[PDB]
Amino acid sequence: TDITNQLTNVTVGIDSGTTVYPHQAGYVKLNYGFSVPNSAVKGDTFKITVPKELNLNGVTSTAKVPPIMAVLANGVIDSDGNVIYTFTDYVNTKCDVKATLTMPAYIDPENVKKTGNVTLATGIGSTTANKTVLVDYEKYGKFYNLSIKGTIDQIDKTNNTYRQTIYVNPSGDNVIAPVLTGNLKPNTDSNALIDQQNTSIKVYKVDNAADLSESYFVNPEDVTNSVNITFPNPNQYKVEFPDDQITTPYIVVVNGHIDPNSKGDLALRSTLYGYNSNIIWRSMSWDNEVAFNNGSGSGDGIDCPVVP
């Protein structure tokens, strides 16, 4: 049975700052507390509502919700993105059961494509919480006529893959003989494996910077074949783009692998090299890093009465 509505003493809340910076390791915490009906038995359920503006995975390909520990309940994310918890047999014998739960949640890149005010709401049954925050994706990086910014997604730790989206020349500058390299970030013990058999790169031409996401969600003019992609040094890729200039942005999507025996995390550096109109050679670098977070849940009950 679904016992969502028979939950009592329900409280809900959202913990975050007033501005969230999804590209500076910002996230939010969804908090919940409730009493469970003594009449709860194993296999009973209850549903948390999670809004479209969030997901529970962020940079990671999927997420697990915290089992609530006393196991009091096991959770899964449904196809709407809401969370269903199933009660264990713990409720079969325990009374005055109570529980609290926290889940980190992340600004969903596809539903929040631009910087602006977002009102976030979650809840359990009729008990809801809401918060309105500014989602600030901030700015791409720039140095003379060299702009660049990149973001990671879909870190899959089952399959050891990652994906990285880079905007080259998001600022629409003229670059003469532009070159991009993709590297590990020094001294991180980075777990990226960047080579011919671990790394596949695609590159897209952009007509109008305006068609680009601030969130870096990308819906993939493919110009992969018109460019020269090479693996010139250990754990480094290089992308070489008729007149030796570019005047538009480019999207570079990298489908790579990680090393699960590596002692560090996914930590990446991408560099754009190019001349300006004065024929000076410069470079602009962009680091990409990650931070992982977990939620937790716990409950308590007492022995139900026994007639004496």
Binding site: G26, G58, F143, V290, F292, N293
Partner: peptide, 12 residues
């Protein structure tokens, strides 16, 4: 030569 960065959060 110059340098910026992003960091992103995600589920364990």
């Amino acid at each position: 030569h110059h340098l910026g960065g992003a960091k992103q959060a995600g589920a364990v």
